[PDB]
Symmetry: C3
Subunit: 209 residues, 3 copies
């Protein structure tokens, strides 16, 4: 029915497959710390899966009215990003043994970043959508700012490159500028999410970090 | 007005009475740890009380449309379950001195379980309600999976038997199959909640755990 | 358009200015603990800023119907209070090195307090609004109940006097009794918020606590 349904079904299946591979490999962990990284890495695609399923089936999509049109917004992404992004940041934070001040700041910065994105996504006044997009980007640069060693650096670097693509997709997407159709927007985000999560997941859990 | 109002008023009063008994008995605690268990055990019926009051009075109930009918759904239960279930799991987790990996996994598993229940409760497509019910049940079996010693075992066992009744109520309830009228569904859930919370509460706080 | 817009623009700017002053002064912190207090103190006006911006522009305001009228409610305040109040309580809690039982209880008490305020704010049955206001006040007295030493005492005392003004504003405001117009209500709350946050912020971060 919806042309981006295939990307949605394809994200759901891939988040589904990542959760499981990780649940199974996670059996044989006595290490308190590896338990921490295994819990986080698996939870991320797990919550991700559920939200991809929500979007795939009509739940997780609304028509936000702006520009003289009702616009299809997939709100369910922010409900996923709300929990997964702080946890990915928790893997990195934990990985390099960061302090409370930093992890909290990182996680707090994360909250407002995804928190302003939702508002930008839901704002009925076209112009303002971009004001909120801006506050979100600034929170991101703060996180990228604040952001064993070898595997951390490779992960810190994967994070940086992948996350920075999100605001651009939002900006050019059907969410911002409206030049990129929802299709490829759902496709691009599906590629970002399975990498930032499953790719990130593998790199990490497969490592000796 | 609503026939299950009595169960709602009866749940509110009982959650009300459990919160208080616990607040008062909680006075005389110097123990850092007993403080932890006292804070959790009291918070649970406390948040519970507020949500029973919300449902009792019209707030906390919506008409979800499916099956060619508008259906009365008590969304307020998921707003309560969202916070109380992870805390009950926190009593057990803390009780047996579980690791970060486990408690997080438990709490993360909990979130999606109640998180998928809400979506199942709110899904307008009858068929899908059960797809989400299924993902929720699987998260539960994961928790029951992962799930001093004497009092833990009695508590672990109370949890297991009580929580497993919830999906069945949802499934046969006015939320799922629609064979059990809302009345007895509100009644059964009122009995599950006052046990999983007040009963659990007593067993625990009354113990030497 | 809205007469309280100036208070909203004036709160946004002031929360904006507090966040920044704190972000900049927060550069030169090697102390794990000062990092904790710097992360919290800055996050508070930061989340505050975003919610003042939300209210300033139409997002963050709804017409709740009661009394035979549709009433302008600024729901966005509860979305801010939800996160900032537990963090202000975290500064104090951390400041005096409180236990897990206490901080959790404090934070849990906080949640229901702001959590009942939102419901009171959203209740369509005029009479009930006050029932929920009451449960919220009781949670507050519980927090004020539970509530280096010199700077803690000055902060504990600032908290107490400022927070106690909130329920009265709500009660006499356009949210409760409806005797105080939204204008001065937005003005009074703007003064409470910039003090409880920026004032509190300065007192604390400027100190040797
Ligand atoms: C698994 C998903 C991840 C890591 C998602 C990350 C999303 C972002 C970093 C989004 C950022 C945005 C902005 C900076 C501006 C507003 C729009 C957003 C939410 C797309
Ligand atoms: C105090 C309340 C407690 C402990 C409530 C527990 C509720 C559950 C374990 C619910 C489980 C459900 C499913 C497994 C499937 C979807 C429907 C639910 C939410 C009833
Ligand atoms: C930065 C904001 C702060 C510290 C806000 C605090 C707000 C309160 C303490 C509000 C309390 C309320 C009641 C006790 C009853 C219901 C209405 C409220 C939410 C205004």
């Amino acid at each position: 029915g919806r042309p981006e349904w295939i990307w949605l079904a394809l994200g759901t299946a891939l988040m589904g497959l990542g959760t499981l591979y990780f649940l199974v490999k996670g059996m044989g962990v006595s290490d308190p710390d590896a338990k921490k990284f295994y819990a986080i890495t698996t939870l991320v695609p797990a919550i991700a899966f559920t939200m991809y399923l929500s979007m795939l089936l009509g739940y997780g999509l609304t028509m936000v009215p702006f520009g003289g049109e009702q616009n299809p917004i997939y709100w369910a992404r922010y409900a996923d990003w709300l929990f997964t992004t702080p946890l990915l940041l928790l893997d990195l934070a934990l990985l390099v043994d960061a302090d409370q001040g930093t992890i909290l700041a990182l996680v707090g910065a994360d909250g407002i970043m995804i928190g302003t994105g939702l508002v930008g996504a839901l704002t009925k006044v076209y112009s303002y959508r971009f004001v909120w997009w801006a506050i979100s980007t600034a929170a991101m640069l703060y996180i990228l700012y604040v952001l064993v060693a070898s595997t951390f650096k490779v992960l810190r670097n994967v994070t940086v490159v992948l996350w920075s693509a999100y605001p651009v997709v939002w900006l050019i997407g059907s969410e911002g500028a409206g030049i990129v159709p929802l299709n490829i927007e759902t496709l691009l985000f599906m590629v970002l999410d399975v990498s930032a999560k499953v790719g990130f997941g593998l790199i990490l859990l497969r490592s000796r970090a």
